[PDB]
A and B are shown apart, each in its own frame.
Chain A
Amino acid sequence: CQLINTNGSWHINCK
């Protein structure tokens, strides 16, 4: 799992 910030928006992606 990686914590991502896209133009301020947060999400977690897990591979």
Chain B
Amino acid sequence: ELTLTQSPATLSLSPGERATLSCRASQSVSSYLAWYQQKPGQAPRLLIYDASNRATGIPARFSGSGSGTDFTLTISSLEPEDFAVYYCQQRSNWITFGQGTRLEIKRTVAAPSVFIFPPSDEQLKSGTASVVCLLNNFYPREAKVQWKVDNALQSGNSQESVTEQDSKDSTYSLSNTLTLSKADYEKHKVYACEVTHQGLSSPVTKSFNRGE
């Protein structure tokens, strides 16, 4: 009944900068609003409730403001432990949460190293063929991967996943896997992964021909 919409989805900043996170409610919630922090593999932690009331033990650099439909969490000066996911939460009508704003480490643009891997021979006698494309240590995290079978764009047959931000170089890596039956794998011979990323001047293509 009340939807909380958070923005931005991702915020890229450095230690010491000011962070401003927004939460918008689909109808007024007065002040019945709370903010939570969550780090990977950990539970959320209460930061603010009743829109601006700082929870016990929460440092003073966290503050909340707003009322009605428009709210903001401000972190006055970021510390490295503050990089995490943040959720708002409403209790004016039942209980709902925003979808979260992810706070990540800003760094210079870095291009992905792109590698393509044909299916192993041992997998092909099982009768299925997976082609793996790896984008290694790139930044920012936005990147588009597209598979071309005999220079035909693929659709609906591949899955990808992305690493958490590297804690030493602050890059991301992405692995994308193309699943085909061997029978349809043997119909075609060139297989290509074309990746588009801010760090590459023009889309890069890494490929192989089947049987090599």
Contacts and interface: CB of A to CB of B under 8 A. Distances in A.
Interface string A1-15: 000010111100000
A10 to B, nearest CB: 6
A5 B93 CA distance: 9
Contacts of A10: 91
Interface string B88-103: 0001111000000000
A9 B92 CA distance: 6
A1 to B, nearest CB: 17
A11 to B, nearest CB: 11
A7 B93 CA distance: 8
B1 interface: yes
A8 B92 CA distance: 8
Nearest to B91: A10
A5 B92 CA distance: 11
A13 B212 CA distance: 76
Contacts of B92: 9
A4 to B, nearest CB: 13
Nearest to B32: A10
Nearest to A9: B93
Contacts of B94: 5, 8
Contacts of A9: 92-93
Contacts of A8: 1, 93-94
Given A8-B1, A9-B92, A10-B91, 5 more contacts: A5-B94, A7-B93, A8-B93, A8-B94, A9-B93
8 contacts: A5-B94, A7-B93, A8-B1, A8-B93, A8-B94, A9-B92, A9-B93, A10-B91
